[PDB]
Amino acid sequence: MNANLYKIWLILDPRRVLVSIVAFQIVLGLLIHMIVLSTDLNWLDDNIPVSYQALG
Amino acid sequence: TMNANLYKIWLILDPRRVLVSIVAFQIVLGLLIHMIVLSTDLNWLDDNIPVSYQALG
Amino acid sequence: TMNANLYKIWLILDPRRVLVSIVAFQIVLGLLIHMIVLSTDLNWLDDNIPVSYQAL
Amino acid sequence: TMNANLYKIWLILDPRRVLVSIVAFQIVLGLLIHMIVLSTDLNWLDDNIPVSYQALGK
Amino acid sequence: NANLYKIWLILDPRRVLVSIVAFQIVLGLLIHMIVLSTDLNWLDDNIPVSYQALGK
Amino acid sequence: TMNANLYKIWLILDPRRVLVSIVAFQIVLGLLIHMIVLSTDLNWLDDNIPVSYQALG
Amino acid sequence: AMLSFEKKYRVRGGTLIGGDLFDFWVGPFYVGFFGVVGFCFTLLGVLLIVWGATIGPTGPTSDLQTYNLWRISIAPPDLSYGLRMAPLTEGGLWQIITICAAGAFISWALREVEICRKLGIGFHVPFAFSFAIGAYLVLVFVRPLLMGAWGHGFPYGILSHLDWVSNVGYQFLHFHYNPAHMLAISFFFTNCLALSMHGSLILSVTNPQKGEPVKTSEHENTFFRDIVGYSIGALAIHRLGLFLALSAAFWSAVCILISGPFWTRGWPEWWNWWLELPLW
Amino acid sequence: ITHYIDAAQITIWAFWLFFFGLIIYLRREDKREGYPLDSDRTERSGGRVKVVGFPDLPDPKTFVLPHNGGTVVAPRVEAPVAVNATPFSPAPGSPLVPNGDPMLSGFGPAASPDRPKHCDLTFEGLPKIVPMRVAKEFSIAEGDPDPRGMTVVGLDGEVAGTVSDVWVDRSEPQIRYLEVEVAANKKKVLLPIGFSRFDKKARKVKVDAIKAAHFANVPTLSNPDQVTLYEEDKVCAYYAGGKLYATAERAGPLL
Amino acid sequence: PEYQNIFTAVQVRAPAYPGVPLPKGNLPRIGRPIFSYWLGKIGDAQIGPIYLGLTGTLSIFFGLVAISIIGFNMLASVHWDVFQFLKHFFWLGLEPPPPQYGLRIPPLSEGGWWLMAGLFLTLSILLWWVRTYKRAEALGMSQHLSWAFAAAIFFYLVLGFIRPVMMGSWAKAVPFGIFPHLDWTAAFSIRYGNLYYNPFHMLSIAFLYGSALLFAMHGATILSVSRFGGDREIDQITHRGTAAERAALFWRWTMGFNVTMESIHRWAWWCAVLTVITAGIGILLSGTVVDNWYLWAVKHGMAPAYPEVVTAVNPYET
Amino acid sequence: LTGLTDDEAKEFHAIFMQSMYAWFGLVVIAHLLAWLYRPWL
Amino acid sequence: SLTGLTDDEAKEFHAIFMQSMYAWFGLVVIAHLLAWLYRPWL
Amino acid sequence: SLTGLTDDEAKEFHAIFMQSMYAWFGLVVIAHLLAWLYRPWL
Amino acid sequence: KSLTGLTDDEAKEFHAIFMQSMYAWFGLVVIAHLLAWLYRPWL
Amino acid sequence: LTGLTDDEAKEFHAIFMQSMYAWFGLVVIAHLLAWLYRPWL
Ligand code: BCL
Ligand code: BCL
Ligand code: BCL
Ligand code: BCL
Ligand SMILES: CC[C@H]1c2cc3[nH]c4c(c3C)C(=O)[C@H](C(=O)OC)c4c3nc(cc4[nH]c(cc(n2)[C@@H]1C)c(C(C)=O)c4C)[C@@H](C)[C@@H]3CCC(=O)OC/C=C(/C)CCC[C@H](C)CCC[C@H](C)CCCC(C)C
Ligand SMILES: CC[C@H]1c2cc3[nH]c4c(c3C)C(=O)[C@H](C(=O)OC)c4c3nc(cc4[nH]c(cc(n2)[C@@H]1C)c(C(C)=O)c4C)[C@@H](C)[C@@H]3CCC(=O)OC/C=C(\C)CCC[C@H](C)CCC[C@H](C)CCCC(C)C
Ligand SMILES: CCCCCCCCCCCCCCCC(=O)OC[C@H](COP(=O)(O)OCCN)OC(=O)CCCCCCCCCCCCCCC
Ligand SMILES: COC(C)(C)C/C=C/C(C)=C/C=C/C(C)=C/C=C/C(C)=C/C=C\C=C(C)\C=C\C=C(C)\C=C\C=C(C)\C=C\CC(C)(C)OC
Ligand SMILES: [Ca+2]
């Protein structure tokens, strides 16, 4: 890495970047959880360890 | 072959807008390529490799 | 056959707007061409080459 | 046989707007003609020439 | 007519030129489109040969 | 039998606006009439006269 | 009672009909000749609606009579009566209520004109209200006349008139393809967008963030230039909103007026003129 | 299992509860100007009974004005102002009739409140509405006639004067008033664009609101290079009085 | 006769306004403003400048991808034939995935493009929401626009995402196309037993009609008092003038009550917003809770009854 | 009226007519080729 | 000079424009020769 | 500077920013290690 | 002087870098298409 | 022109190029792992 990468905060407002990173990451997390629930990896409706509707 | 005065591009194009446009373009491209590949035979989530987890239950 | 005063075009057309327009056009054209090729027999993603990766 | 004073057209029409218009027009026309040709028997992409690359895998 | 040249005292030469260019390009596109919609179509007529048949 | 002072019509109506209106109306009319005729029995393009050129292929 | 600034505007005159005879207020309401005339039409029409609910479609003793607010329905006559007056119990009641409604609406608009004359303001509001009246009259007068029977009007019932709309629409198979209807809807949607934008902008500059002073005309213009690169202007947004709302009513009236009188086939098939142009 | 109550029915009832709450909120906001009402019930009660209806008035909000212009509160206690008119009849709900010459009465469509005696300002803090003499960066849009020098006619077609300048909005560029040098008294008075029709080929401004001789009494500006809110209302209201007052026929009725 | 203040008869010009200065962290605006004479006849003649930071750049990129994927698929559906694309344009569409794929990412050849356009259009819209939010923040303005925009986004999300997910199938979402999305609208009412009998459909109509009613009333009211400067609503709100007094009295004398110059904009805000709130709720309840709106209305006693003048034997009974 | 002087209108007309005639010539040639290749009447 | 160019500038621009246009048209002719050889269409 | 921070203020922010981002990524790695152990996906 | 504001020398310098960068770009395009032709010839 | 001095443009370029090349190196590693796991040509 470059020794003067810290100078990025002389041209990009630190508070704006921080807020934009947090919101980007929260939406990214919702998106990926949604993607994975749409696949074979779904962990909510896999009936593992057991089916709880099938117990009643 | 590159150019020794290539650095002068930042006398032409604004460095802030260039950075912002690269970040934006690469986010969209990254999402687009993952979705395109997930829509094909290369899909790694619904391929039942290493196993099918919907079949275990 | 080319012309010796062709550099004078930058006395006519703004270098900044020309550079920006070039990269915007080339990126869009490249997206378009990959889309066309993917929609035809030349598709390299769903062609099951070298193998099909979807297991039963 | 064109006129000798035809260069005087650049006293009337803006060379900048003309060059930009020609470039814009030519690109769109190029995209249009390629699509028109692809829509016909002349199609060179889905003609399976030299070979069908999907047949290889199916 | 001998005094026809005076029309350029009435109608802007620049706008007439641009309008002529714009109209002729649109007309040219229109007529090709119209002719291609009919029996005279020279692109999809399998002449000299059908290239899709060649690939079969 | 035109009138001798009919030229005074241009003291009333703008010669420029009439000219540009005439050209515009006539072009629209010519496009419209060609389309009307092509939409009838008189159609001269899709009548296979002198020959059907699709029938050659 | 009066608004605390109102008394200095309560001037004599400006009537179209009536002069001093009916030139007075009743509480907040200005009355005048068209207030009296409109009141009679209104009270009669409403009471005939309640009477129609009281006897129902087949008499007050039948199982079809109902005071359920959703189910009350006063219906127009059979198409066989043409342009004649039906018997009261066979659709004539609907016809009298229709005449009352038109008179109530038109009297309301002329009362509005007299109020504008008192206040020395422009006549935009009664002019605009005339577009809604015009659409109502296309529905119960112009379109029925062109087809030959008052029975083409819609019934006066909260849910029963939705059944009328449905069955008139599907007479044309797929009414969504009516071209004037598409245009009118575009105006209704664009009007709603424009209204939410306008309401939002005025409230956001007069109620700014805490610690901020009231904002300026320069803020209003800057704000939408920042979002869409254009600001129409504080006068022009009211021009635009009026244009969109009146256009929505106007193209509504056109779209039902052509449905029957000027077109009888399915609405998708109208678009075959386009498909059949000798260009493609 | 079957139940009459269902979620669609539950939700629609929940909406009605919200909606009626919303209406009451809105009606309170609606009462931030003009309330409590001027009634004859408050007169006879010696002021004891304030007429406000339902819902009651909200607690006052504050508007903080830019450039240290002060604070406006709403609702607010506003002082009664005498009405320059006499009731046509003593019965309640009767209209009043302006005293004196109606044009000059400050009553009816000639009426207006007393707005503040300072100018509306640009964001940068300059007087917003000013003549082109002052805002020299303004011009007439190419394609449109310059109103300066046009002749102004009243409702009866008589010459009231000439346009001596154009008053523009520096915040949102547009003409707000024409300045008219009145033939009768050589005063320069504002004419709102809202009361002005252009006859472009004749280079005439037509004013339907008043007669040519009525221009002599258009209210005057304290400072020739700016206009206060107070003066704006006095000017516009004077023209509007003409809509009802400027001729006898304008009183009505038609029949 | 009188000036109606519909068209500006005489325009004036001044150097273009670059805009209210923004706080540190905002990027400089872009574009050289131009003037349109014909826009200046109905409103402001200035076009530009515009703000474009990271939020809007990302929004526009996602949105162009989404739009291009739609148009590409429309043209592919007429085999690249541009002339037939123009002929059939209103009929062409980008189709939701087949029901067999459920909510799984479907193949590129049969629904993957719809799913990508919906994803990328949705992100484009959500980022546009953030843009409207940030642009108000930088000017020191309150967030009324973004709240109303969120209400419209709610409805959009219900149509294409929330309801399809609740119902287990992207095939139940909306196609991208002119006439195809009208087919979808009519078919949805057919499938769910007549949307006229959905009470939130009724409310949404009341508020859509009410929005046109209120803008006709308010638009006309303000132009009728523009002769008194009533279009300048900020200073009529802080400093009530004869414009605001005459506007309120016109309505009080007409219909018995009135609002204020500020609070008419609150009535307008809520009317427009409730149009799309009730629309979202109405669709949200269709298929998930109520399967046939007409029978729901029969059950709750709302459907009118008519004398029987036509009737049909059920051949499934016979 | 346009701003052109009389002499200027002469020079523009000479070139305009010469150029328009050149364009019309190509159209005739293209049409001749089209008729030889695919006669349409 | 409506466009602002002098008479010599309009002469200089024309020369470079006409030369570039012909070179572009040259490329187009070569392209259509290859297409005719690969896939004749008439 | 463009943002207003001095040079040492950019240095201090960068050190706290990089440390926090690495700690965040460390959590992401732990979560993905747990997920791979529970439900390996390749 | 000029329409863009570049001097004559500035336009020469920009042209030199622009032509070199563009030719480097076209060279990559050629290599990409040579690879593509060897992997999947399409004519 | 952008407002940067010639020396500022030099410094930004050096950091820009070093950062972009590092990003490209991550992209390369990612595609090497993907090709070993699931070669697609
Ligand atoms: C079979 C298909 C493969 C696969 C093959 C590939 C290939 C090949 C690549 C990715 C790339 C990525 N993949 Mg993948 N990927 C798979 C499955 C996943 C899954 C999942 C749920 O299954 C997810 C969430 C990801 C996520 C990722 C992202 C980390 C990354 C896209 C970043 C981006 O767009 O930045 C856009 C933002 C910018 C460019 C801003 C630039 C500024 C700086 C330089 C970047 C800082 C941000 C941060 C440090 C980036 C983190 C990357 C590092 C690994 C830390 N992949 C599988 C198993 N994936 C790409 C990548 O690794 O990039 C290096 C890449 O080349
Ligand atoms: C069977 C049908 C043929 C085919 C028949 C033709 C014919 C015939 C022509 C083209 C032309 C083009 N074709 Mg093709 N083409 C085919 C398949 C392709 C495919 C593909 C994915 O299959 C691609 C992407 C291309 C792409 C191209 C472009 C390079 C070019 C039009 C550019 C333009 O509009 O400039 C418009 C822009 C301007 C005028 C601005 C100024 C130009 C600038 C300065 C230069 C830009 C680069 C230049 C075009 C480089 C050309 C190099 C080679 C000759 C390609 N063709 C096949 C195999 N193609 C045209 C061409 O070659 O033009 C020379 C042309 O005449
Ligand atoms: C299957 C059924 C059909 C269909 C069949 C038709 C038919 C049939 C008609 C419409 C009409 C309309 N349809 Mg359609 N329509 C369909 C689906 C749609 C959809 C949609 C999202 O799918 C929308 C947005 C629309 C939109 C529209 C509007 C363009 C128009 C209604 C507005 C109007 O007339 O205003 C005008 C406003 C009025 C007429 C109201 C008049 C008000 C009067 C003057 C005052 C009343 C005062 C009142 C009594 C006061 C009471 C006082 C209180 C008690 C105190 N339709 C489908 C596909 N549509 C109608 C139309 O255009 O009518 C002209 C019409 O007839
Ligand atoms: C029978 C079916 C025929 C056919 C019969 C015709 C006929 C007949 C004509 C054309 C004409 C044209 N055809 Mg065709 N055409 C065919 C197939 C094609 C195909 C194709 C993909 O199949 C293409 C892309 C073209 C393209 C063209 C253009 C070169 C030209 C329209 C130019 C214009 O509108 O200028 C309008 C713009 C201006 C006037 C602006 C001013 C001048 C500009 C700046 C310079 C333009 C240079 C010009 C195009 C040079 C070409 C002249 C040649 C003699 C052709 N044709 C076939 C095989 N075609 C026309 C033509 O040749 O014009 C001379 C014409 O008369
Ligand atoms: C109260 C409910 C109503 C409503 C409210 C509402 N809508 C809203 C808002 C609000 C409050 C906004 O703030 C937001 C807005 O910004 O409006 C101005 C929006 C909006 N409502 C919109 C449309 C819309 N709203 C609708 C409806 C409604 N909106 C309701 C009826 C409708 C209907 C009825 O169907 C539509 C079609 C948009 C105008 C805007 C949201 C815009 C958005 O999200 O944009 C991102 C999406 C994209 C596709 C971006 C694409 C980019 C463009 C293609 C421009 C390309 C630029 C490029 C650089 C060009 C380069 C080319 C070169 C050659 C030069
Ligand atoms: C033209 C654009 C829009 C518009 C504008 C508009 N409407 C207006 C105005 C304007 C400018 C007024 O100034 C005026 C008003 O005063 O509003 C407060 C009016 C108005 N628009 C109103 C209603 C309304 N407007 C609607 C629509 C629209 N109005 C448009 C979309 C609708 C719809 C869309 O359905 C209705 C329900 C009223 C609030 C008001 C007119 C009030 C009036 O005329 O009062 C006199 C009449 C009564 C008090 C009741 C009369 C009763 C009848 C005598 C008997 C009933 C017969 C009726 C036919 C039965 C209908 C039964 C079923 C259909 C349920
Ligand atoms: C189906 C169930 C019901 C559905 C209803 C959904 C409604 C929500 C959906 C719309 C979202 C709107 C978001 C923005 C909100 C907003 O913006 O409000 C804030 C603004 C105020 O901001 P300002 O301008 O003063 O200052 C800006 C400076 N910050 O306006 C309002 O105070 C409106 C007042 C709220 C409405 C009151 C409703 C009360 C109902 C009571 C019912 C009691 C019944 C009791 C029975 C037991
Ligand atoms: C060839 O064309 C070019 C390239 C030249 C450009 C031209 C483009 C053109 C002409 C485009 C034309 C477009 C038209 C006419 C569009 C019409 C569209 C209409 C009317 C749309 C109407 C409604 C659509 C709706 C409401 C769709 C909503 C879809 C949603 C909300 C989907 C959301 C999906 C999500 C969030 C997916 C997430 C994916 C997950 C995470 C689940 O992955 C597992
Ligand atoms: Ca896997």
Ligand SMILES: [Ca+2]
């Ligand atoms: Ca492959």
Ligand SMILES: [Ca+2]
């Ligand atoms: Ca091939």
Ligand SMILES: [Ca+2]
């Ligand atoms: Ca052929």
